[PDB]
């Protein structure tokens, strides 16, 4: 039952993030935070799977996708802060 609960939490967070990035269209900050939420949910279910089926590559993937998320967030916020200079 616990894998079910973990995975359903991850799925509902993913759904929430995608609904945020779709409904809200103008606020770039909410947009980028929703992308961060999507990557967070992906990370969390990666870890849950890495521990449910006893296998390690889930956690290496988790660490690397953390790196990817940090990069995207930094560069996208740069895009925004140059958009809002005018």
């Amino acid at each position: 039952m616990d894998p079910i609960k973990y995975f359903t939490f991850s799925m509902i967070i993913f759904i929430l993030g995608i609904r945020g990035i779709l409904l809200n269209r103008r606020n770039i900050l909410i947009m980028l935070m929703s992308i961060e939420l999507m990557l967070l949910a992906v990370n969390s279910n990666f870890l849950v799977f890495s521990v449910s089926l006893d296998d390690m590559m889930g956690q290496s993937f988790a660490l690397l996708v953390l790196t990817v998320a940090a990069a995207e967030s930094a560069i996208g916020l740069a895009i925004f802060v140059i958009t809002f200079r005018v």
Partner: protein, 153 residues
């Protein structure tokens, strides 16, 4: 119990992230989402990744988001699916897990030592799969030179 507490907090806080106005409120609720997710991971039994979620997700990214939304403060321009996945009869009925609770078979032989997840993760990630670790160097380098070429006049 406490698992449900953390899950509920994370859910409602993400809702506020998407809906609540005053974007600084959104960033606060976002930090809170990540904090409770880290506590959740800690409950799962992976401690290293919990502290990492604290350090780089909360202490590093969210502080950048807070910085930027600070300088522009004036810039204010399922129950069906849950039942469908809980009525599958492929999940153990909690009554079953009760007596079988006293059925697990400890090995006492794979735990004479014990690799904490930090140690085993280091082993794996650096000896093997190393190109998987060189590439993130390149993506971080891309991040930093991108920030420079974009904003630095």
């Amino acid at each position: 119990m406490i698992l449900s507490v953390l899950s509920s907090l994370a859910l409602v806080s993400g809702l506020m992230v998407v809906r609540a106005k005053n974007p600084v409120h959104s960033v606060l609720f976002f930090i809170l989402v990540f904090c409770d997710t880290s506590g959740l991971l800690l409950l799962l039994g992976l401690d290293f990744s919990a502290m990492i979620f604290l350090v780089v997700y909360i202490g590093a990214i969210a502080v950048l988001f807070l910085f930027v939304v600070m300088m522009f403060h004036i810039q204010i321009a399922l129950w069906w699916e849950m039942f469908f996945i809980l009525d599958n009869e492929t999940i153990p009925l909690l009554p079953t897990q009760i007596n079988t609770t006293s059925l697990i078979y400890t090995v006492y032989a794979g735990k004479v030592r014990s690799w904490t997840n930090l140690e085993t993760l280091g082993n794996l990630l650096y000896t093997y799969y190393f190109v998987w670790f060189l590439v993130p160097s390149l993506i971080l380098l891309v991040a930093m030179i991108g920030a420079i070429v974009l904003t630095m006049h």
